[PDB]
Every structure is written in C-alpha cells, then in structure tokens.
Amino acid sequence: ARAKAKTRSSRAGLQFPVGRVHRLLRKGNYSERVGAGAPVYLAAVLEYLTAEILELAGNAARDNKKTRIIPRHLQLAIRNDEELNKLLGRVTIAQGGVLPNIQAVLLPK
Amino acid sequence: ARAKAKTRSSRAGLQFPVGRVHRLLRKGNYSERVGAGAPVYLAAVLEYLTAEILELAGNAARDNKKTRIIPRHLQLAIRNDEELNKLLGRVTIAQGGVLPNIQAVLLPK
Amino acid sequence: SGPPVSELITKAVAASKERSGVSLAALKKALAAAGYDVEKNNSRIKLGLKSLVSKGTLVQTKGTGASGSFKLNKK
Amino acid sequence: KRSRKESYSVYVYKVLKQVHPDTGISSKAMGIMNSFVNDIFERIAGEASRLAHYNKRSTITSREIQTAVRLLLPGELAKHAVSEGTKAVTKYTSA
Amino acid sequence: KRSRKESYSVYVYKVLKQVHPDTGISSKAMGIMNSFVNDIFERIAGEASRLAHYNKRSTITSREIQTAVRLLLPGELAKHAVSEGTKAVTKYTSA
Amino acid sequence: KVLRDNIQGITKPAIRRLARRGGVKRISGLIYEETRGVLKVFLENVIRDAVTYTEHAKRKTVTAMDVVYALKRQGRTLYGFGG
Amino acid sequence: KVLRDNIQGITKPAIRRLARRGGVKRISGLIYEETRGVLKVFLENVIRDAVTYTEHAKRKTVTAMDVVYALKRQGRTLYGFGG
Amino acid sequence: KPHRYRPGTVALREIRRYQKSTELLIRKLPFQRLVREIAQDFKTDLRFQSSAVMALQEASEAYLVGLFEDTNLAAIHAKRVTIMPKDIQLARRIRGE
Amino acid sequence: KPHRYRPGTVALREIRRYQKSTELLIRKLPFQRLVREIAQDFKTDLRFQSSAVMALQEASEAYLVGLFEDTNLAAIHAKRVTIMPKDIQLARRIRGE
DNA sequence: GGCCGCCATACTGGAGAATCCCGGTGCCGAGGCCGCTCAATTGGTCGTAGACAGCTCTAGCACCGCTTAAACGCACGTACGCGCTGTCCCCCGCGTTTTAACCGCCAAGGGGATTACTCCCTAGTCTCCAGGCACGTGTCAGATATATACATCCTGTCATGTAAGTATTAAG
DNA sequence: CTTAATACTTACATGACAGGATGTATATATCTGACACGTGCCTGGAGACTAGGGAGTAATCCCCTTGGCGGTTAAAACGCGGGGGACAGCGCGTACGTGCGTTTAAGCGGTGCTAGAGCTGTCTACGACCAATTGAGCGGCCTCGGCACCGGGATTCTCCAGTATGGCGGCC
C-alpha cells in the first residue's frame, strides 16, 4: 500500500536533484547530520545562480548571433558581472578566451 | 586483571599527544575511519616542526640576550627561514613586528 | 600673426637670468604668462630651443639640447 | 556497457530551457557548468562545515547554508538567493 | 565552578626544554604555538580528507598524510619530516 | 551613543607611524584619506563576516574567535587568539 | 629516450601572441627568458603536485583530474576538465 | 642655532625604530569607537570583546603594513620615495581587491 | 613602396585578435615533450593523457594572461609601455611567491 | 629694423588591404530517441541534537577624575616627482626559408579499470588508570629608572680645482 | 705708436677633514608580577575484544596510450629596417619632513551595572538507516542543420600624399 513516490525537487518545484545534493553532502563528510531545509536551500541557491549565468550566456550568444553556448560566451558573461567576477576571480575557464581589455595609454591618439 | 597502559605517544616516544590528535582527526570531519599510522605520522611531523621553530626562537632569544621567547623572536624566526616563510606567507602574528628591512634607495649615499 | 617666437623666447630668458638657468618648464610657463601657446606649438618650441643653442646667442649651461638650464652668451 | 557516471547535464539543460527555450549548448560549456556547480557546491559545503565546527553543531541546517551564502556570495545576488531559497524551502515545507 | 579548556601547552613546553633546557616562555608566544598547531593540523587534515575523497578511500592512513607533507611542506623540511615519520612508524610497530 | 566621524579617529600621525613600520620614507597628503577608505572597506568586510558569525551563533557580543575565522577566511590568518 | 631542451620549444612568437592576449604590445628582449624561467618553475610546482597525486593514486598514467587538483591547490581552480 | 635634522633622517630613524618596535601604533580608544561606529551601521547597539578590538587593531596594522610595503615596492619600481595613491590602487588591483 | 604599418599597429591588431580569439597559442607536441621531459626529471617514464597536456597548456596560458596583465599594470605604473622582467619579478613578489 | 619670402609641421583628402559582412555548402556534434539501472524515496523507527528555560556571575559598558602624550597646527626647510626633450637603443614589421608540427594513417601493447577474493584494520565500548589543565602562589628577569659612552649627523673649517682681466711686449 | 695675444695673478665654488651633542645605546639598582612551579582532579587516553567493513591484491583486457611513416605548410626562425621607447639631466614648484608648544582627550586610575555569555536539565523535534520500488536520468545511437569551412564584396583601417600657418630665414 505504498503511496506514489514523488521527487523533492518537484516538491520544491525545482530542477536540481535535492536527493543527489543531500546524498553528496552526507557522503562528502561535512557534518554528521544534514538539516531538513539545508539541501533544498542549497539546491535553490545553486539553481538561481545557474539560472542567472545561463540567462547571461544565452543573451551573450544571441548578441554574438550564435544559437549555441560556447565558452567564449561564458567568459564574457562571468567577467562582465562584478559580483560573479568577485566570485570567480581566481577561476580558470577552458577555451573561454579573455575580456577585450585594452588600456587607454595602449590606444593611440 | 589488566595490563598497565602506556600512552601511544610514549609508545612512539614522542611528546605530542597521539590520542588527542587522533580524536581531533576523527571528530574533525575528515574521514570516518582513519589509518593507524596517520596520527602518529602527523604528530611526529608537528613535533619536529615545532622543535625546529622552537630551536630557532631559542637561538634568536640568546642573540638578543633574553632568556625567554617573545613573539618578536617568533617573527624573526619565521620571516628569516625561506621554507617556513613559504609555510606562513599569509599568516599574521600578534605583536610580532616585521623584519628590519630598509630598501637600498632609502639609505643615504 | 605678430612677431616670431624667437623674440618671445629671448625675452622670456632675459626676464630672469638666474645663476642656475631657466628650465624648459620655467620658460614655457613664462611664455604662457605672456599668452603665447605652448601646448600645440611645443614642437615649434622643441625645435627652437635647439636651434638657438646651435646658433650661439644662447648657450646651454647644464642640460643637453633643450633640457636643463640655459644662460646668455658671454658678450 | 559501463557503470553510470553521474553528472549535471540534464538539470542544466532544463534550467537553460527555462531561461532560454530558443538556444542550444555545447558539451564543453556543459563541462564548464559542471565544474561551476561542483566548485560552488564544495565551497559552500566546506564553509557550512566550518560553521558547524564553530557552533559545535552535529548538523548542518538551512541556517548554516544561509550563513555560508551570505558569507561567500556577494551582496544583492546573495540576498536574492536567500529570497528564492526561502521561498523554495517554504513551498517545499508546504509539500 | 569552571570548565576545562584544552591547549597544547605542556607538549610545546617539553619540546622547548628538550631543545633548550634554559629558555623561558612568554604566554602569547604560547598562544601563537597553539594557534600554529591548530592551523597546520587543520591544513593537513583537510588535505588528507581531500586525498581520501580523490582516491575514494574512506580511511586516511600514513600514506595520505605523507602525501600531504609532500604537497604542503616545501622540500628539505618535508624530506626530514618523512624521515622522522618513517622512523616513528617503525618504532611504533616495533612497540 | 551614536558615533559619527570616528574614521578621523585613526589619526594621520598614526598612519605615518604605520608607514614607518612599513618602511615608507615619504608619505603624501593624499595617502591618509585613501588609507582610511581602504581600511574602512577592509574592516567592513571583516566585521560583516564576524558579525554574521555572531548572529549565526545567536550571540550579541563580538568574540575574538569570530575575528580569527573572518580574517582567515580572507586569507589573513591571525595567531594567538584561541584559534 | 632523454630530453634536454624543450623549454625553448615554447617559442618566442607564442610568447608574443600570449602577451597580445595579455595586452602587452612591446615585449623586451629580456622578457622571453624570464617567461621561460617562471613558466619553468611554475610547471615543476604543478607537476610535482600532480605526480605526487599520481603515485599516491598508485598509477603510471597521468590524468587531467590530477592537474585540476594540483591547480586548485595553488588557487588556480580550473573550469573545463572536472570529472 | 637649535639642532635640526634633514628630511629623511628622522624618517629613517622612525623607520628603524618602528621596525624594531612591536607595540601598536594606533590610539586604542578612537579605534574602538570606530569599529563600534562601523558595526552600528550594520546592526544596532553591538558590543565588542576588548581583546577582539585589539586583535582587529594589530590585524589592521599588519594588513596596512603589507599594503604599504607593496606600495613602497611599487614606488621604488616607479623610481620614487614619495608614495602616492596610484601605488596603493595598483597594489590592491594586482593583489585582487 | 609597400604599404607598411606603424610599430604597434600590427601588435595592437594582434592584441584585438587574440583577445577575440579563444584558441591555444602553444604548439601541443613540443609542449608535450617539455611536460614529459620535466616529468622524467622527477620520475622516469611517466605516461600522460593528451587532455592533461592541453589542460597544462591552457592553465599556463591563463597564468601568462594574468601575469602580463599585472606586468602591464606595473609597467604603466613604471611609466613604461615596453614591459621588463623587473615588472614580472615585482608582480611575482606582490602576488606572494 | 622692417619687410618680405620659404619650408616644417599640422591638417586633409586619397588608395590598398585585413578583416567584417554577405552568400554557399557539406558535416558531424546536438539533441532527440531508446534501453537500462540505480537512485531517490517513503515510511517506520530508533536513537539522538539542539532549542528552550533558568540562572549566574563576570567582564565589558557607563561614568568620573587627574594628567600629561599626542595631535594639531604652524612654520622653516630641503628634497621630490616629474615634464620635456636628448640621445642612445631596441624590438616589432615584413618578408622569406626551412623544418618539423600537424595530419592522417597504422601496429602494438601498458596499465586503468574492472571483477573477484580474501585479509587487514580500525571504530566503538565498558572500564580503568594516569597525566595535563585549573588554580594558586612566589620569586627573580626584565621593565623601569639613573648615570655614562658612543653615534652621528649636522656643523664648522681649510685646501684645491677651476674661471677670468689686462700687462706687456712683440710684431705690424 | 698702435695693437693684440698670452700668461699670470685674481675670483668662484667645491670637496675634504674635524668636532659636538643629544639621541640612542651602555652600565647599574629596584621590584614585580608573571614565568614558573607545585597541587586537585576528572576527563582523557587507551587494553581487550569484537564487528564488520574497506581495501590490498590477482588478472586481464582492451583501449587508449605509445611507437612509427609519409606530406604540408604552419610555424619557427633569421635578419634589415625603422620608428618608437627608455630613461637620464636638470630645474622647479612644491609638499611634506620636521622642530615645538598646546591641548586635549587618550591614557591611567577608580566605581557601579547589568547584558549577556555561558553552564545545566528537558525533551521534543529531527534526521539518518533500511527494505523495496520505481522513474527519471544516464549509456548508446543516429539523424541534421547550425555550424565548420569556403568564397566574393565593403567597411574600415590606415598609411600616404597635398595644403594653411607659422616659424624660420634673408635684404635694403
């Protein structure tokens, strides 16, 4: 007489796997127990951040008239947001390129 | 009734508490199971490191004609060892001061 | 139009006659005090301040070319 | 066949279609996003472990995770992530 | 009525009197010792936890700590550190 | 009770003393207020972290252990304070 | 079998192009050997950690995930090869 | 005449003295007032362990010591003895601030 | 007379191009030879995945991006536009190594 | 000295090419479809973790009172940053030549990984003893104070390297 | 006689050498409190045994790395030139560096408060463990059109040649 087993991501109405995140925290050895709202809240934060960065990636790709995300778009999206730049200052992107960044003394008169 | 117990620090013949380091490893959330040679190995490493830095501090204190260590001696001992500086480049020391260091252009003539 | 800047520069250097000579800085600020342009004509002053050292009415004291000090000739 | 190697492809794919139904994504960008989600996951996990250490807590709860967010994540995106995380844990609390 | 607070006092005292029997101790220098012991212990323990994760080993043995010494401790000291560690595990197995 | 202009409480000669400890020979007049702003931003970040530690602990008094944790999470680890 | 000089295989025009990506327009004659030296020392700082991982893994084949760990240890966190 | 040292003599003497010295270089009471001031701007009536205030004091002092030696490295790299704000801005931005 | 660009014009065009570009600037196989060379200088006859070699390549290229950006900032602060190894040493010291 | 002409350099319009912008075209990652599996789940359950409550007691907070340290401000003074050319210097632009990198194509096996096996190895726990911290104290090393000695740095002083007028005398 | 060239005496700065004086280091008396040493205890470390699991070890295979072969031209590399850079020289307006008295508020010494920091009993919320079950997500495949690669015209870059203006140069 077992009821229908739904998913905690759908119970939060979210897309990241709450079960996988709670599993990885239980086996990642960061605490003995994990609070009930902790993986849901963590997954919500991660999904919200992923949502902004994917929106920025799609906007940058559309601005670059391309319909598929390339790592160039990801670097241009991350480095042009100040708070994400402070998040990912020391983070290396594979094949992302660099910002177009020239100093004013480097440009001619 | 019972065998008379020696500390595992005494079994190693080392001064650092093997039991205390072992329990701080097991309760520090690094692994649920810990191999036997790990805390004695780490404790020997720590005791040797403190032995070296205490030797350096003692010689520095005898240089300044002071019988007792001061954190000025600690600052002089850390900052004048290359590999210890590599260990503690980003570490701030309370009441330590800095090295006597004047740049060559700052000196007269 | 007006007179050429050679007369202006000679007046600027003859205004003071310090024992240590007028810098290019002090003389261009002196010419700006007169009202003569020193910003776009700095190439003209640039060539002039070596043409006059070469021509011998003025001699260069301590600097080289147009740098440093300048003083009047002996006679 | 081989053993299944779990990754974050399908969830990133769904969130991308939520924010952009029209566009595609490359597998290299997919791996970069997997590195992003794993990196921030481990950062927040280590920070919450440190807070559980400092508070001597056997359990990391959503208070700990919120604390780790507001420590790590800068400013207005952090307070937003608080807002959607709070809304999410409320509507998950109401099943 | 008070509660005990643990520190690394007597061990560093023993080690100093071994290397310098006539040298005294200031208390805030001893605080720097306790904080240094805690700092380096946490660094090596976190590195051992990460290596245990990366090799998928749920048990941290002396090999993990040896790797951590080879990583964090630079060179000459690390070589000496391996020397007392090998001699210590040998004499511990012999005892 | 309200505190208004204590950024000038860190005096200019105190900045000169620190620059002597930093080994600075000549200190411009613009150095002091820029220094005040830089330390303001730095200590604002530090106190943000350490307070966040404090209300996460459900405490009201700022303790030195929280100061140590906040400093070391910015890569500025301090010894001698129960860490 | 042995190799003796492949640091010069990292060619001068490659360094030129990298500084074009780095935004440097004029690259002194002394730059190239300085870059070779610093890339040299940094690459032992990387590969020492990576190999130490590898015989800690008891392997003989070097994986990229070892490079990822060695870089994130040195604060050089990599996106694009995890897992 | 009264004796008077040249510019730099007293400066270098203070430099060697404060490199020799280990005490705090900040007046403690206005520093405590300032940290209370700044922390009041986040949450009200906030209280401080005084030892934590002195800990913030030497942490601030040593952080500025590191910033100032980096600043002096920039200034001597700019061939100067007088430090100027672009030195500190360069140090912050290269260091990652 | 052939049309010839002023000094830096091709250099700044290359700057715009390679900042626009995302590809690697190092030849993969001599780089692989150097990796194997220094590997056998630590432990003889290691085997290397090719992806690890390109990962080392792109990590080195990212480091070079960072250190010439810091070096360019230093050289501008050093009132120069031709960078020098003194700038690289200064940036290396400021970064803490 | 005035007046008048001549060229250097800043403006100012013209031409060739590197790359962007438009098509065009085949193709191979994208993503969609399909089989698989393991992974999330769900509920009992069972032990347990932290919020709550109450207290308590102590160290920061507030208030106060001398007391000069230090800030402050003013003021002389020397040195600092750097602006601009000058002058040596040097590294990109261009172009060509060579050579091995790249491609792409093929052989072969090393160990990465996977499964199996059996063996170490260590956390836990009741209990037992033993050291290290809590706490108190007590006593000489260094802080502090007082009288000397060099440092040292500015100041005071003298010899020396260097620039210049006309006597004088020799030649027109 | 007139005139002119030089050398010698006369004028200017510069660096070389001695000395004090006060700040800073050097030698001697005090005291104190904090290092340091001695004591209660109870938490902490652990011996024995066990449960049970991770993990070392064999093997094999296959595929993914290593080894080799032919052809291109991408890349390296070498060198001439040219125009930019780097950095010193020197001066100058300045800009703190530093001497010094005041003020005052930090510093130092003294008093009362309670906020709250933290110890202790409760217990009720909490969240992991386990048998089973599934369904969504992952291994594999397979098409296709957005993109990879290719080709032609503009834009734009960008240098390069022809003009006012202004400084530079000459005569009567």
Author numbering:
A (entry chain C), B (entry chain G): 10 to 118
C (entry chain U): 35 to 109
D (entry chain D), E (entry chain H): 30 to 124
F (entry chain B), G (entry chain F): 20 to 102
H (entry chain A), I (entry chain E): 37 to 133
Source paper text:
Here, we report cryo-EM structures of human H1-containing tetranucleosome arrays with four physiologically relevant NRLs. The structures show a zig-zag arrangement of nucleosomes, with nucleosomes 1 and 3 forming a stack. H1 binding to stacked nucleosomes depends on the NRL, whereas H1 always binds to the non-stacked nucleosomes 2 and 4. H1 contacts DNA with L1, the amino-terminal part of α2 together with L3, and α3 to stabilize the nucleosome and contribute to chromatin compaction.
H1 is absent from the stacked nucleosomes of the 4×177 array, but is present on nucleosome 1 in the 4×187 and 4×197 arrays, and is present on both stacked nucleosomes in the 4×207 array. In all ten focused-refined maps, H1 shows three DNA contacts, similar to what has been described. The H1 loop L3 and the N-terminal part of helix α2 contact nucleosomal DNA near the dyad, helix α3 binds one linker DNA and loop L1 contacts the other linker DNA. We show that, with increasing NRL, the linker DNA emerging from the stacked nucleosomes is more relaxed and permits stable H1 binding.
